[PDB]
Amino acid sequence: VLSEGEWQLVLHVWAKVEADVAGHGQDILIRLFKSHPETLEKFDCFKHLKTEAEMKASEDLKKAGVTALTALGAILKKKGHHEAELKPLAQSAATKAKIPIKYLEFISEAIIHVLHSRHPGDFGADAQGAMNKALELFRKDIAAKYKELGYQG
Fold it and tell me: Which phi and psi (to 5°) does residue 82 adopt?
C-alpha cells in the first residue's frame, strides 16, 4: 500500500521524467539491456541493435522508450485507481507480446536505477521505496489480467 504522501513522492519525481521523456527512456532501456542482455532477443523491433552506441543512436529505441514511459506515467497518475487504463494494455500485452512478464521486474529495476542516477535530490530512500511499491503494484495488476486469460500461467 502507498500512502498518499508516497504517491506524491512518485508524482513529484515523475514530473522530472516528463521534462525529458525521450532521454529517460533511452537511459532506462539501455540500462535494461546492459543489465539483462538476454532480454534484447525478444524485442523484435530492436533486432538490428547490438551495441550501446547503436542503441544510443536508434530512433526505434528512443520512440519505444517514449511510448513505454507515456503509458506508465498515465497509470502512475491514477494512484492505484487504474483499472480502465490498465486492462486494455495488459490484455493486449498478453495476446500480442510473448515477452516474458518477468521482464517487467527488470525494467522496473532499470527505472529505479536511472531515477536515482539523474534525480538524487528527489529520489531518496522514501521516494525509492514509494516508486518500488508503485511499480510492484503495477506488475501485480498486469499479472492479474494475464492470469485471467491464462497467459503466463
Answer: -120, 20
CATH superfamily of 4-149: Globins (1.10.490.10)
CB 76 within 8 A of CB 14: yes
> Which candidate, 29, 19, 21, places its Cα nearest to that of 56?
29
- Asked if residue 69 lies in contact with residue 28, where contact means CB atoms within 8 angstroms, the answer is yes
In angstroms, the CA 48 to CA 66 distance is: 19
Cβ atoms of 135 and 108 closer than 8 Å: yes
Q: In 3-state terms, what secondary structure has residue 77?
A: coil
To one decimal place, what's the resolution in Å? Answer: 1.6
| Experimentally determined by | X-ray
